[PDB]
């Protein structure tokens, strides 16, 4: 369950395993195409402020 979460958890596994690459990327592609952020970016970099923008036809669908 919750609690135990560090910067770049399981990213060692993402680099090697083909099956891992499938899971993260397909999710990541959805996060960009629906909620307009990279979940990878979040895990790898752990930023402090993230700004979601709703410009353009694709932006509109994410805002809705």
């Amino acid at each position: 369950g919750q609690g135990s979460q560090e910067q770049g958890m399981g990213m060692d596994l993402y680099k090697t395993s083909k099956a891992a690459q499938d899971v993260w990327n397909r999710a990541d592609n959805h996060f960009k195409d629906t909620y307009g952020f990279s979940i990878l970016d979040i895990v790898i970099n752990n930023p402090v402020n993230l700004t979601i923008h709703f410009g353009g036809e694709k932006g509109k669908r994410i805002r809705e």
């Binding site: 990279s38 923008h53 410009g55 353009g56 694709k58 994410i62």
Partner: peptide, 13 residues
């Protein structure tokens, strides 16, 4: 365009 496509910014024209 290139600099926006680089950083994966598809939603801020």
């Amino acid at each position: 365009k290139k600099q926006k496509s680089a950083r994966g910014i598809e939603t801020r024209p």
